[PDB]
Structures are given as structure tokens and as C-alpha cells.
Amino acid sequence: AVTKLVLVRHGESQWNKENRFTGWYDVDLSEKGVSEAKAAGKLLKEEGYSFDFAYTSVLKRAIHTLWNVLDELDQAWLPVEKSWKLNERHYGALQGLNKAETAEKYGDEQVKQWRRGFAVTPPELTKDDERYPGHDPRYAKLSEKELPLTESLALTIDRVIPYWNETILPRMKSGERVIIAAHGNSLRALVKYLDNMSEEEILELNIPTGVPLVYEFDENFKPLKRYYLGNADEIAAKAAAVANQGK
Amino acid sequence: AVTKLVLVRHGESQWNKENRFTGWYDVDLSEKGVSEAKAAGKLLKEEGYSFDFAYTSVLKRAIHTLWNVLDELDQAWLPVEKSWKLNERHYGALQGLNKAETAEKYGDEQVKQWRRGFAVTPPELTKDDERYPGHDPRYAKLSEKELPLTESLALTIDRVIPYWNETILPRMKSGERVIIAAHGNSLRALVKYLDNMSEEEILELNIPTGVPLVYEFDENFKPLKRYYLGNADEIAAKAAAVANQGK
Ligand SMILES: [Cl-]
């Protein structure tokens, strides 16, 4: 039989709306993002999807997207595992800054590189910064080397793909239907790996907020196909890159 | 050091409001119950409580109480384990019936016995009944003997206390701060065991919806003290037994 995996980026966050770099800052869903999360769950139900297990990050924009989806499915009882390994790419000293203001002060091309350059890291925090993850109780079990000062997509891959191979994929292989509710760069990391994409190809991909992305796997767990659920015109428009100045 | 445990009964459910026997029927919180759940979380924060791990049932009135509490604590990231072993006592063929109507048809004393008699079971379902737990996907892993047709408090103890001793108490002993969000009879089962109560004593106890109940344990994990958090006059009034005809 074919095995299905469902991926969903968190619904729009308040800092997505306000055009601020977020990273590990734990911002909530906007009002529109709550709407998006509920719509994704209703659509999954309509399309005949239910699950056996869910993975998400430790960031509330993703966790709350999952809770809203589970309620639409009448699966609030589902087992859930919440892991920092699925967190958004850390944005270093850019966390909290407005993207347009930052592009004006430092240059539009510099901001594009800090957003998207494959192995490029945003400017680093120091450990005394209020934003350093070591101060936060949900990272109490992490080492200095695990606690980021900044991350690139390359470094995001280096934590997401081991979690995939050690934990998520084996659960799928045991016959369980998995949903992953996560973030732009953690899901881009997984998609690059599953789709055999180059650095040039992954730089072009934007996964839109709140849109289910379904993968089919064959009996050897080689990906067979992937597709979005919902309104094609709306999704494709939403998957275009947005300027630093906003939409 | 003293170890703290926090217990909380689900916020008021829609069938609590409507005076219907619920059991394993998966009814949601009423509007007032959502208010109660959020208030419990805000109070726990104000009183200096945070957690390392949460247990709850597979029934949404309890799960949603926990989600609301965790959001007030800014601990949506907390590890959660959802177990049928913490479910409400199953109400057999009474599930969905109005308590007042049932007391009129069968007698007030008969209803009191079906509600509260220690080893008394409500009238049984048959396996073909739409309400039989075997039809529901979240009990797919249970055996016939685990799937109830009816339960008493005695039978509720027989599943809650092993879960306590095998799973919950060891986690506490490892130094983790636990919260349990559950149900009237599953929490009464645990309290009887922890408080060394007789059958006569436990029959008198009503744990009110949405009220934190804190236990202190000594170094040998013998209970030292237990107390409610919140407004004493309001809580004590709410802990009185309500007639079959309602309040
Ligand atoms: Cl959860």
C-alpha cells in the first residue's frame, strides 16, 4: 500500500502580519492564522484524512495550529510529540526586527541573504542577550552546542533530517498515519531532502501558511508524489516570494 | 524537599450544564467551562506553579481544560500524555439521559445508587449499541475486557491506581512536576487512594469543576497535605452534592 504523510506550516503568525523576523521568538497566531488553521483541519476532514500520531515544534504558532486541526478532525485525543528539533530557523540578532526597516538600514540584498542564503547565518546573539535560548525553560535539556546563537537553512537541515530518520520515518514505517505541524525552514529542510532538491531549487520554494502538503510513499518508502490540498489559484498565489517591504 | 502534584477536574461541560449523564460520551466544555479552565491556569500562574509533564484522559472536556491551563502558563510546549485509563467512569445505558427525567422514571434513590454506589454499576450497554466504546477509533488498542459496558467507582479505581503506580508516580519520583487534568470519578479514585478514605468517606466527596487541588508529598512520597487553590467560599459551596433535579 501507499503511505501518506501530511505536512502543514503554522497558520499566519502575528509577526508574519507585522513583517517582523521571528525565528525562535514564541509569537502566537494572528486572528487570520487561527482561521487558516481551522480551515486546514476542516479541509483535511472533507478530503478523508485522519491520523494516528502528530509531531510539532515547541513554538506556539505551530502547536496551536495543530490543536485547531485536531479539533476539526475530532482527534484532540491524538498522541502528540513536541520537539525543538522541528523549530523554525533561529534568526539571531534579527529576531524582533521589522524586515522593511532592516532592509533600509543594511540593504535589500543583505536582507535577502540573511533570509534565504543557504549556508548564510544571520548576525549572532551573545549568551547574555535576553533572547538567548539558554534562558528559556523549554530548552533546559539542551547543551551549549545545541542552543543556537543563529542558524542557516543548512544548520536547520542538520537537526531536522536526523529527527526524521531516527524518530518520524520509523513511526511511519510501523504503519502509523503521521501529521507534522511546523515552520517554513524546518519544512523546507524536510522537503529538500525528500524531493532531492539542489540549493538553487530549495531557495525558490515557499511553503504557504496553513496549506496541507501531502506526500505519498511507496512500499520502500521512496516518495512517489506530493501535492497541496485546497484552492489551487489561492495556494499558488500565496506560494510566491514576498518583498522585504511586505505585500 | 517536598514534591507538589496538581489535580484539576475538567471545567464545566455542556452536559454538566444540561444535567445529562455523560461517562465516556465525548462532550465539550460549555462556555462557562472554558472560563473556568482559563481561570484555573491564571490562578496557578499567580500562585507560582509551573510544570514539567502533564497527564490527561482521551476526552475533550479534560484535554481542552489542560490546553487552556497550559496557555495561561505559557507552557503549550509541555509534554502531554493522553490515556483512556484516566477517563470518567463509564455510565452504561445512562449515557445521554437527563438525570431529572431518569430519577422520575426509575426513582430518586435508584438514580443516587447509579451515580454514587461504590461497587454499583449503571445498567449495561450491549456491544451493538452505537455508544459501545469498541466502535470508536481511539480505543482501537483495547481488548474486550478493557472496553466497558458500564463501570462503578470500584472498577474505575481498578484502572486508575495501576496507572498511577506504573507511570505517574515514578515520573514524580524522578523529580518532575506533574499536573493531571481529568474527571470526577477518576480523580475521586486517586484521592481515595492517596487519602486512605473508606467507602463511606469517598461517597461524600465532590471535586468541583476547574478548581486546582494541590498535594504535597514528603521525601518518601507519603502525602503530607492537600488543599484547594482559589476563593474558599466559592469552592466549598461548589463542592456540595447537587440533587438529581439540578441546582
Ligand atoms: Cl497535545
CATH number of the domain enclosing B68: 3.40.50.1240
**Residue A195 in grid coordinates:** 524531493
Q: How far is B174 from A6, CA to CA, in rounded Å?
A: 35
Distance B80 CA to ligand 1 centre (A): 6
B64 belongs to the catalytic site: no
Angle formed by the axes of helices A60-73 and A31-46, nearest 10°: 40
Q: Is A138 part of any known ligand binding site?
A: no
Q: CB–CB of B81/B163 below 8 Å?
A: no
Q: Which long-range contacts (CB under 8 A, 24 or more apart) does A142-146 make?
A: A142/A84
Q: CB-side exposure of B231: number of CA atoms within 13 Å?
A: 6
For chain A, say whether B187 makes contact (Cβ under 8 Å).
no
Domain of A206, in residue numbers:
1-247
Q: Count other Cβ atoms within 10 Å, centred on residue B242.
A: 12
CA-atom Rg of chain A in angstroms? 17
Q: CB–CB of B134/B127 below 8 Å?
A: yes
Number of folded domains that form chain B: 1
Residue that the C-alpha cell 520537539 belongs to? A83
Task: Say whether A59 and B77 touch across the interface (CB within 8 A).
Answer: yes
Distance A73 CA to ligand 1 centre (A): 14
A10 belongs to the catalytic site: yes
Q: How far is A115 from A123, CA to CA, in rounded Å?
A: 11
For chain B, say whether A135 makes contact (Cβ under 8 Å).
no
Q: How far is B162 from B142, CA to CA, in rounded Å?
A: 16
Q: Which residues of chain B make contact with A10, given a CB cutoff of 8 A?
A: none
For chain A, say whether B137 makes contact (Cβ under 8 Å).
yes
In the sheet with A213-217, reading across from the earlier edge strand, the strands are A80-82, A53-56, A178-182, A3-9, A213-217, A223-228
Which residues, 6+ apart, have CB-to-CB distance to B197 below 8 Å?
B191, B205
- A63, A77, A183: best mutation site toward chain B, by most B Cβ within 10 Å? A77
Q: Which residues of chain A make contact with B60, given a CB cutoff of 8 A?
A: 71, 76-77
**Residue B23 in grid coordinates:** 461517562
Residue A204, classified by CB atoms within 10 Å of its CB into exposed (0-12), middle (13-18) or buried (19+), is: exposed
Distance A67 CA to ligand 1 centre (A): 7
User: Nearest-5° angle of CA A103, CA A158, CA B80?
Assistant: 95
Q: How far is A48 from B54, CA to CA, in rounded Å?
A: 31
Q: Nearest to residue B103, comparing CAs of B203, B245, B247, B241?
A: B245
Angle formed by the axes of helices A60-73 and B60-73, nearest 10°: 170
- State how far the alpha carbon of A105 is from the alpha carbons of A101, A109, A244, B144, B216, in Å: 6, 11, 12, 68, 56
Q: CB–CB of A12/A32 below 8 Å?
A: yes
Q: Which residues of chain A make contact with B79, given a CB cutoff of 8 A?
A: 82
